[PDB]
Design a protein around this nucleic acid. Sequence first.
DNA 1: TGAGGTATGGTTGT
DNA 2: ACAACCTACTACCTCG
DNA 3: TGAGGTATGTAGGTTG
DNA 4: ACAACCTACTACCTCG
Lengths: 574, 564
Amino acid sequence: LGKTEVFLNRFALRPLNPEELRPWRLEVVLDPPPGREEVYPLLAQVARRAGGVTVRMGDGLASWSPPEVLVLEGTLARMGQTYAYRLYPKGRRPLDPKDPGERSVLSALARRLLQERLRRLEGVWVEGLAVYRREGWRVLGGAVLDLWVSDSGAFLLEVDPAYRILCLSLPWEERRRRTREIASWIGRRLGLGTPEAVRAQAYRLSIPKLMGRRAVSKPADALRVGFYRAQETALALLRLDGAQGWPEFLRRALLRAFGASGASLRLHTLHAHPSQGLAFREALRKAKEEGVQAVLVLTPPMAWEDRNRLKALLLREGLPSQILNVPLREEERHRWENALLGLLAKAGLQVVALSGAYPAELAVGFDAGGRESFRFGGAACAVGGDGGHLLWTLPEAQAGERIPQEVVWDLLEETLWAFRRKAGRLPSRVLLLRNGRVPQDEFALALEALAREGIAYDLVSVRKSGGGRVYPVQGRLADGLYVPLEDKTFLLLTVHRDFRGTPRPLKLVHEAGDTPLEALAHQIFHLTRLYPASGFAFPRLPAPLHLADRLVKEVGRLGIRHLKEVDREKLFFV
Amino acid sequence: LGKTEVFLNRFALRPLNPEELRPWRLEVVLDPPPGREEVYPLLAQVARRAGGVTVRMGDGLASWSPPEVLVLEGTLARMGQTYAYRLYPKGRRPLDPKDPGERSVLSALARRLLQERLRRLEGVWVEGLAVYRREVLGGAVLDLWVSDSGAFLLEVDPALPWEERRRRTREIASWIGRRLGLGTPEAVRAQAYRLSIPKLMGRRAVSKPADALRVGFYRAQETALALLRLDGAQGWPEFLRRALLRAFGASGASLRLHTLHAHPSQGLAFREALRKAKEEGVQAVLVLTPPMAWEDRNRLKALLLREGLPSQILNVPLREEERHRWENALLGLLAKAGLQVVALSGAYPAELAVGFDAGGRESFRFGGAACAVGGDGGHLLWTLPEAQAGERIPQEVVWDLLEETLWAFRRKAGRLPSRVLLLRNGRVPQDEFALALEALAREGIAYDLVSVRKSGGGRVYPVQGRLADGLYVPLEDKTFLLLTVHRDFRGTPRPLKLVHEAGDTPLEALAHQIFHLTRLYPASGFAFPRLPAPLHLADRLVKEVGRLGIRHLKEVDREKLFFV
DNA sequence: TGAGGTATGGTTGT
DNA sequence: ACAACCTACTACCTCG
DNA sequence: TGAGGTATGTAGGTTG
DNA sequence: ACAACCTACTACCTCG
Ligand SMILES: [Mg+2]
Ligand SMILES: [Mg+2]
């Protein structure tokens, strides 16, 4: 617990001058007139050809450059069709930084000023908003930049160091220094004053409590102390390498885990090979009939297509599988212990759970996956307060990133129904998580149905980009940092390792609900530690979202047609 | 068989003159030169703007008009952008109607000639290839192509009792032929074969599937059905209860009828009652409701489905004398509960038949399969569809769906089928079945691939007497028409057009099994579908999944025909 | 939703 | 473009 | 396919 | 357009 302070990778520069607060307003006339759907990009294009610092404002243009130095008359080309533009100055409109509407226009002007000013910088490498400065192959050093306006009417610089390959992670502290050096170097050159780094109040969240059969510090420990909830299991081994039976150290480790858990284990061997064709599927069917819940596949590294085909084939017989490549030595403990954890999660075992109290006893994550011209919208959930159960539900095919209102609700209803099957009652409050942005009204129906059903809720948008960066004012950088920014918007540093590079905090937006922000940050931060198939490192995303992202990715890869007979408690996609 | 003869709605006109056989070739020069996506359509626009009777041929142009009366130099506004074209005549090339490529060009020229010559008729109503001759207005749709014996061929279809349509077809054929200077049209005859009448079975022989309600079902098992009333009324209407009871008495199977005392208006508590019902054994639900809006219907269906309960809707008000409607609803209910209402009796080359279709009307589709297992079609099954970008079903998807129907046969019969009949709705895209075809060969399963096109088959009229269904008309090698269904009061029939894509089963045997398969469909009591049951089921499967979503089907048995 | 076929904006492929 | 298929809704009439 | 995040560079998408 | 998110593969290092 505790208040503390951090720097963001943003820097206050000079106040907008009186001039800039009243940008020049210009109307645009185009011949011929564009259709209703094509005009906005066209206005933007006009904004560029006019030159100087000019952006679209409403249906027209705003410029910080007087109209005499703009190119008021000229020509454009879009989708084959050629247009002729003329810009008529129409006085200047006083823009106030408080009216977030106006500020947005000022920030657009600010970015254009920055990009533009940077193009005129001598002996430096500029690409859009990137600048490279420090070294027939070469390493280039620099930063990605941004410029907007604070509501008190001053320039804000976001700076983040970056490299350029022309022919790579940075310790956090180094990145912080280079961030400052580059912020001043550019502010002094740009003519925007001396940069002063922005501070924010940060709060240190309580360390979450992870439980196997007993307390653990990492999920891999459940292999020695026992699982959070063990039950009678049967696992099968499929060897693609022509070898023996179970490697003894794998056997001994599984037996040890189950003995500590107080549950019984049956180990099977599949004496079949997929090159047998349909006979192979018969063996699977039999294996399944005999109780096998998941399969460990020992194989030389497989090509993606073979891997996918194999997974899909077992899946079609209701058998999740965990691959572990050979050659395999006993000393490669991390790899094979992670494999083992994978197998157990795919068998429907609860390896770890959290201890502690949280606002919501059901947490659900929503994502969309697939790289083709259609996506899958899907959900994964953590049931009970402890996250005592991890489930997935069948995805749905959709046109794009938006998940249809009815689909969101249906998925949600399945997870609620899972809670009701597992606890005998409805949850009093649910935590709804969305990977990335929530499209307008996407959750409207669902939200209404929960209300109707007497279930309290919170909606939280979780963005993996856009949060910027956070550095301690003093001391070492630790994860579990909560940084409230504006109202209902906050950063959350969930994971950090000194060797990984510099952390990227999540950016969260509280979209609906009245749970205090700090509480949401507490439960989400804690949720990152629930993921069972990573032994030694916690995911950045809370387990519902991490699982959901993996779910839609695997379904995107294998297809949805194989999942009919796969239990929703078996996490086949880890 | 009995051999016989039919007219097609095609008419032989004059042989191509020695001049039409050596069309002029022209080279096209465009400025600027187009990217890959714009060149073929751009040549087509140039073909039209040159005028006369000109078409794309290869990378250039062919005209039956000399270059001197074409607009050899001009411009093309395309996507508002702009190309300048010049055509350079490069002598003529002889074309021969026997090559099928060089011929494809002659037919293209023929269609253009037809369309062009029709525009220049006065005072009739022309729309592309359609003309309307007095009376709204009445007329015909026309086509022109080239036969391999190198003669023009006219398709004419008024745009009716079949006899009327035939008459009008003849009238319009001659009226057009002389007027267009193509000579006197003489209608084409084709040898047609009369297929054996399929033998449908319930508990015993039936002529229609609805008869299984009186004589008993092909295979009955102990069933439980539930009733959901959205109308605020009683219990089971008595006539429905008697009819069901009667059907199961005849079948020798026991029936248990339940009532759901829940309303969907109770939200989740309603889902609980569903779950409870399903545990107790309910297999399907009959829903008595006032007519529902599409969304409410979809939502309701999907909700029951999510608890693994297929549903049959029957609208109130309902009167006992509306026997067709409610008997059909009853047949639906039973198919959705997994009963085999009817099966065929006979010997077919393939003891597994599988249909493939794609559905959905959005930017993506669902590729799905439905099957008839056993030589009698003793089982009808669906498989979980897959999301895909367009009409093409991916090779691996085709094979996976197929493997599930094989596996259904293996679970039912305890062995692999000796030969399968693979049916594709619409055309088969290039190598769509290649992987599946190879897999079957590696498993020692014999196969046939048949493309089934609902349009393109044209029309068939008897030379003499009344028109009856189950007409097989071979055309070229491997292609054939199949008249599967007809009634007088529906209008003139539309033969299916079928292409034997892979396999060595004789065409007549394919036609036999396919024709017979049209009678297997259990949910239509009084009228057989045009498509054979595996394709009809499959078409309906991808339609319903395109409507509800695929997310509801995980707990729904693949023997329960929820989409009928 | 009762069912059937006959009537009147999209995908493949060159 | 365009050839040749297709999607899915509608109304009509009648009940293999 | 061992797992995580952090990095570049692909090659590029959806929402509004 | 473009702003601001995102998809999914890759290599690196190390093992809460
Ligand atoms: Mg994995
Ligand atoms: Mg029905």
